[PDB]
Amino acid sequence: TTKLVDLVNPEVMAPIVSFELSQALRFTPLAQVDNTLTGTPGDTLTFPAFTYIGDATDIAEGEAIPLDKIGTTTKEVKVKKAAKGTEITDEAALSGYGDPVGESNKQLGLSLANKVDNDLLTAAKETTQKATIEATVEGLSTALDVFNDEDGQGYVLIVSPLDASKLRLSAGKEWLNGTELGAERLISGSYGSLLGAEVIRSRKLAEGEGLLFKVVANQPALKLVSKRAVQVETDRDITRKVTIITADNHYAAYLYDETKVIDLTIVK
Amino acid sequence: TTKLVDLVNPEVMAPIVSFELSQALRFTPLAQVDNTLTGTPGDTLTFPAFTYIGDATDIAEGEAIPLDKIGTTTKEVKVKKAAKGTEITDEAALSGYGDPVGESNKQLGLSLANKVDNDLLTAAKETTQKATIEATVEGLSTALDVFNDEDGQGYVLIVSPLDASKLRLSAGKEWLNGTELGAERLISGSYGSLLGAEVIRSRKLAEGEGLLFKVVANQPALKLVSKRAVQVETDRDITRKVTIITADNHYAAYLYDETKVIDLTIVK
Amino acid sequence: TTKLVDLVNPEVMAPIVSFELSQALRFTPLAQVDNTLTGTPGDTLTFPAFTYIGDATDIAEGEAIPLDKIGTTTKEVKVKKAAKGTEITDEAALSGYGDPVGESNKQLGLSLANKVDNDLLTAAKETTQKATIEATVEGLSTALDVFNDEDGQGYVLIVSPLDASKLRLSAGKEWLNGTELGAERLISGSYGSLLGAEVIRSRKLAEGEGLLFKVVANQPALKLVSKRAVQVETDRDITRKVTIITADNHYAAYLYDETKVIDLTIVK
Amino acid sequence: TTKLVDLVNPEVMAPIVSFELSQALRFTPLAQVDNTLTGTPGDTLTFPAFTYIGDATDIAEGEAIPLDKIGTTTKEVKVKKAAKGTEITDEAALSGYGDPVGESNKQLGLSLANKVDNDLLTAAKETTQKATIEATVEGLSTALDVFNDEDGQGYVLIVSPLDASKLRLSAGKEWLNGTELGAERLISGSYGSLLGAEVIRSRKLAEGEGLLFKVVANQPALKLVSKRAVQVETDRDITRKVTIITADNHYAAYLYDETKVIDLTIVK
Amino acid sequence: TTKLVDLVNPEVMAPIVSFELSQALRFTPLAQVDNTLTGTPGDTLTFPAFTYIGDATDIAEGEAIPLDKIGTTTKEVKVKKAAKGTEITDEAALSGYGDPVGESNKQLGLSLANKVDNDLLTAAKETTQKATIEATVEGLSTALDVFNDEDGQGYVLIVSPLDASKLRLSAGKEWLNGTELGAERLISGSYGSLLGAEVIRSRKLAEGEGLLFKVVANQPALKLVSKRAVQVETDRDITRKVTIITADNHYAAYLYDETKVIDLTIVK
Amino acid sequence: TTKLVDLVNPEVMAPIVSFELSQALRFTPLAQVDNTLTGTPGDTLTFPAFTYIGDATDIAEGEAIPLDKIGTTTKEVKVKKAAKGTEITDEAALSGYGDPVGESNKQLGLSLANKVDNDLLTAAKETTQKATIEATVEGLSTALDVFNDEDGQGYVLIVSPLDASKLRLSAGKEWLNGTELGAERLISGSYGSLLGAEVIRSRKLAEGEGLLFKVVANQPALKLVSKRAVQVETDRDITRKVTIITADNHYAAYLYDETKVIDLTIVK
Amino acid sequence: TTKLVDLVNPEVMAPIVSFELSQALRFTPLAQVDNTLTGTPGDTLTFPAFTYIGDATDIAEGEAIPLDKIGTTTKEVKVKKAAKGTEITDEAALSGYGDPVGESNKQLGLSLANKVDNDLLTAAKETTQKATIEATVEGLSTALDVFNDEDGQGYVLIVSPLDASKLRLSAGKEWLNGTELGAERLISGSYGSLLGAEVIRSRKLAEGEGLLFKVVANQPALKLVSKRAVQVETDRDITRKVTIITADNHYAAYLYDETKVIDLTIVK
To answer: Of A144, C138, F143, G261, which has the fewest CB atoms closer than 10 Å, so is most exposed?
Structure first.
């Protein structure tokens, strides 16, 4: 009756698994890159524009025509920097399972990529146009009515995953009840266009928040002013026997046009 | 250590952006230009027409035949004027980012075109046939019933951007429930013909107002009388060293045919 | 300083507009032209026929068989004439804008055709087959039940412009709710056959009236007996200095068959 | 002045129109001709048939099996006559518009054919199975339930035009509410099958009556027994100068199978 | 004059028509023939089978494992007899129209074949699986749920002809409203699969009875046991001058698998 | 008279039929097999993972960059045992129909295989993601919303047949109505995807419970650790003249990923 | 012996004498004809004119200059009609000496010309300048003093024949003789002038009347508006065998300037 616990049993470990992000980046492909400041002196950038004079008016016979003058307006943005760093000891490197070094310079780039997207989202949230709609086709039409469009243009809608389900069921139940388009959408289960705007889901946006974009070819909603790309430097400390790795980035996130973006608030 | 504040920081300036109108012109293409008054003394035009005699009657053998007469009618309109102007100093022209002179030259024409379009709209907004409908298919049919036609024709309906959404929602909700043609219109978000009449959206019109046109080849509901075309004149003030630019236009807008335009009042 | 108030303003007149009929003729091409009396002496036309002899009957053995006789029937129609004339004075011709003479010449021919169409309508409106229906598909079926047909035929419905709109709206709202044909009809706005009968609109028929026709290949409901064509004459009066123009037409409108036509009365 | 009354006014007379029946012969295509009696002495036909002995039974060991016998049945039919006659005088034949002789010759055959059709209808109407129906699809299903069929066959339905119209209206209104077949049948106006049975309209049937048929290739619902065919014989009377034409027929109409025809009574 | 009553009318007879079964045979294709008992002594057949042992259980270290046992089951059947008899006198055979002996020979076999089918239906009607359903789709689903299946299978439904019409009407009224397939079925009047079960109509089942089957490639619910084939004997009776014909058959009807048959009761 | 009762009636037997499992195996294909522990000492298996550092931060000019460190996590699972036993006596083996030892040998392996799936089901049921739904479409949507996914992915739904039937009828009646796809689903009686999740029926699950899976190419929700295969040992007992048969198996059922499995409780 | 009384002497006719007006036409040459209305659709003539600006002033070195404006005036006149007619029989045409048709044609024009002259005379008298004078030189000078002219020559005087003789007796030696180029003989035999005013005799004016004119190169006193000239047309009356000849004229007489004519009244 020796059994177990009366004898020594070793341990077995499976190969270690690396880290991957649990959220996808969606606000990076929606911005245009600007490279004017790259390689030249100066850390600012100015956008000037002209103004309107006014409409014409009827003039009586023999009178004097009034005279007007044009105007101008300017804006600017300033570049900033973002950095990240970590430290590795000699003892941990020598007697650590797996390869600790590679994970560090992988996660540095991962953190920088997440930081850029977070900054872009925070910048895009600052629009002045607001709306309050319910997750229904009527709500979507009310939200689209804010743009006051007169010709066909494209739109993009980004909402939380939970609101998209309510929207899909609401559209399917009554608006597309008895067609092939509704039945195919139900059976497949995929999300598609509803009123001319694509539906994109992002885990970053919590319930009750959303955005609405109007996509045009040469008037970007967001601009990404870049100064210098990512570079990684590595050094060693002889006294403490440690390795230091750091990374840095030089960029700026700007909201060029506030009219093409509408803030959203969804209630019940 | 040296810093940015110590060294001289220059500036970078993006290219200038010209001005463009935010409202489209929809009523000018529907008007016919008449050049009768050009090159002739007088500023009034008259449109005469003929009338009907009657119907035949039964006559016995060897009996007299009665005699009848005809008649005529006339209408008239009068021309008017509109103008605009601006100035520019010498120092601004010599030392100024971009080209202000071309900007003024373009903006004068833009303002004149906008004024002509507004005049055409306010001229066409004065018919005698009026209707009061709700934004449904039944209201459109009731409005069309006023025309009292006997052959297929082509109609154009002009409404505000807000009314088009309501019309689309109602038509897709009650008249096109199960048909796929409703499903494609809903998914693609495209405004199409409803009862043989096209739907056109204009920002100039306000909520609760619209017009309905009956389009025929050679009988226009609107005309544009052109006594003279647009011209630009320039002069220089030697004493004070300034430049003067002006513009002018002689024309008149007339509602030729009252029967082809219906003034619509849309209420809930 | 000068000004247009002081000077003289002559008047300018656009080219004059000739008259054209505002109502189309839909009842002339539905008749068959008979040319038996053209070029021969006579003013009446006679139509004979035959009569059934009677069905056979059972006969006992060795019995006499009754002897029967055939019979005939006759009908007739007499021609008439229609006339129209006008007169224009010399002073009006010397000092009148446009050209009165040609206008009168064409208006005489227009009036004669209008009279022929009106005569055909009045001749066709006197049939003994009458019905009372509503402007809905059930009313159409009830009216068509009068014909008592045992084989497929074609039909023509002639109604006022207003009744056709109500018929189309009712048919689209009730009977064609969810078919692609109904959606296409609403989108286009055209009028099509509803139960085998085309929909034809004429302004002459006031609201509350209508006619129904059965188009047989060789059996016409209306026959247009003609004796002579249109001629125009001119003459001058020396004593009073006036011009005289006159025109006439010899013809007759007949209702050959009364079973083909139905008279309709539409009430709410 | 001379007028039409003074001059001689001749006559113009259109060609005659022959007589053609206004009712179709629907019944005689549905009968199979029998020529057994042709050329053989006798005028009665007899049909024998056998019977079924009875189902088997279970018998205990050592018992006695019961014994049964067969039977037979017979039916019969008798032939009849039909004839027609006419008289024409030489004076009328010499001076008479048209050709009376050919008209009489054709009308004799037409009368004989109509008599045969009427007897076939009267013979077919005398079936034993009866049903009372409301003119609607479920009524037709109730009718078809009488046949008690396990497999699928073909049926034919003959009703008055009003009954067919009511059937078409109800079927299009309710049972084919939202399919393309209903819209196509409404727009075209055609009459078609309802539950596998075609619809044929007969003017001879009065309102509120109808027939239902089961068509089998070998078994006929109706039989026509003919002893002789139609013949024409002519004779002349010298004393009064007249001509006599007479025709005769020998046949009989029989209902061979009573289970293939149902007498229908349609009430609101 | 001579008449037909005076002369002698001979008699004419059509060829005779034999008897055929009215109700079709549906049950005998379903059963499977068995031939174990033929040619060997014995009249009972026994079918044994095995049972499950039980599920496994978890056992800790150094513990006893419980022991279990298995079992068996038995069932049996017994055969029976069926026979038919008839007798025909010599005088009837000497002077009789047709061939009575052949008709009797055929009818004995027909009666035996019908009796076998009646026995099969009687045996099949007795099962332990029962349910009460209406003539609707929901009732059919309720009956199907008794099987408690998990894989796709094939089912066959047998009901009286009256119930099939009600089922078709209800399915086409409520479940297949707007589909083209429903319209096609209604127009063609053809029964078919409803929920994966094919509909069979039979005349041997009165209203209010029904059966539902599950079809497996090699597992039939009904088994037909045969001991000896059908044989026919003949004999002559000298004393009465009559002929005696008898037939005999030995078989039995069994329900091998109860779970493949569901008894149904249809009530409104 | 030498009846069957007087004589000796023998007994006839049919070939024996072996036992087979009646419930299908569903969960075994959904489990990955791991052989890490086989062949080496040890009863536990460890899976290590890495962690995140943190998002980047803005740094002023000429300031120190903070430093961070990474971390790890671990898990562990342990194997277990299962066994089954059987006893057979000498008398039963010596005199018994068929072979009673091979049947037990086969049933032992069947029982062990069933126990494996029971253990897999018990392991799957322990997830912490739970929801309460109704057997309808919106219940399925509520169940799916727990996953909180932003990209289209496959799913698998496992329910009892009774709940599957209710789901099918509800989806056919309410959502997939008036479409040909639903008509084919009804007529063919097939189970298909409803919102992107397949419908699979397992008879092991009772009424009111269910499971919802998310399928990914290389991340399985369930893992089956293996230590040793199945071996059979037998022995004989001299004292009781009996034989003992036992089986053993060593394995472990583990829930590797919790987020891929949701536990469903279905109530009205 | 044979004088003229015995023989026969015919009669000889001298050539006929055409008719000529007894009173000469004097007021016709004094009017200036205007042919502006011939060939144009109009019957009202407008005469515009300009006005004078103002005197010029003296301007010092370096001073400004004032500005002025002009003006216009208008008048109107309308035309009328005059006509004449004549008839002639057939016998008088065949059996008449001379040419009666030519005589009628010439007298028509003569009468029309006389009518025009009379109308001019009637229109001339409506001036607002009147004076009473004696038949002496001093009275003529007093009458001439009203004009307040610059040049002393260029007057015309028309009086009755007796007043002319009285005037000639009053001025025995101051009356310049009517020699050629002494009295220019404007019309015919306009003999000697007194005080520079020519004297012309007209029998239309009664005693105690007279007109005084002032003739300059471009400013007339009377204007003759002409729309169409004299035309003669012919027609024939069949019933009475007579011919009809008529003529017409379209003209108007206007008093352009009231200050160039003086109406006199001569007292004894």
So the answer is: C138
